[PDB]
Amino acid sequence: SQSNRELVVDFLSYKLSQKGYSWSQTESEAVKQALREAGDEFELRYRRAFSDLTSQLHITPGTAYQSFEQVVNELFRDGVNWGRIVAFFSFGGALCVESVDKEMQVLVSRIAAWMATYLNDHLEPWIQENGGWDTFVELYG
């Protein structure tokens, strides 16, 4: 839904404010706060245990959605758990952060459309199948 939309933005803008950048190119906030937190732990703790997915996608302004998708597919080669969804978000942040690093901040809005597309096309059936976002929270919060 658009629940996923505003979630991609929260995660992205946070990841940028953290790197010193600026996105300007209730119980809900609890999910955002929870995803903000898990991504931070993901980065501190695991990110460097897996192959670098950003190394596999050579991000450019003329990169297509299906390029991104086919890379993101790799993440979920062995199924969907919440962790990999976290890693997914972390990935979008790193694409975003790298983009701004390389003077391609135009991509950022694209990367967010991309993730949102990927979420609804690939992951929402799972999330609702596994208790929605309020469930992710009860576990990882």
Q: Which amino acid is at 83?
A: G
Q: Six-digit token pair at 77?
A: 């080669």
Residue 58 half-sphere exposure toward CB, CA atoms < 13 A? 1
Give the residue with the Cβ less far from ligand X8U, 34 or 116. Answer: 34
Among 25, 28, 54, 73, binds ligand X8U (CB under 6 A): 54
Residue 82-101 contact track with ligand X8U, rule CB under 6 A, x = bound: -xx-xx--xx--x-------
DSSP state of 47: G
Q: Which residue in the shown chain puts its C-beta closest to ligand X8U?
A: 83
Q: Between the CA atoms of 48, 129, 135 and 116, what dihedral angle is there, to the nearest 10 degrees?
A: 60
Q: Which residues of this chain interact with ligand X8U, rule CB under 6 A?
A: 38, 41-42, 45-47, 50-54, 74-75, 77, 81, 83-84, 86-87, 90-91, 94, 140
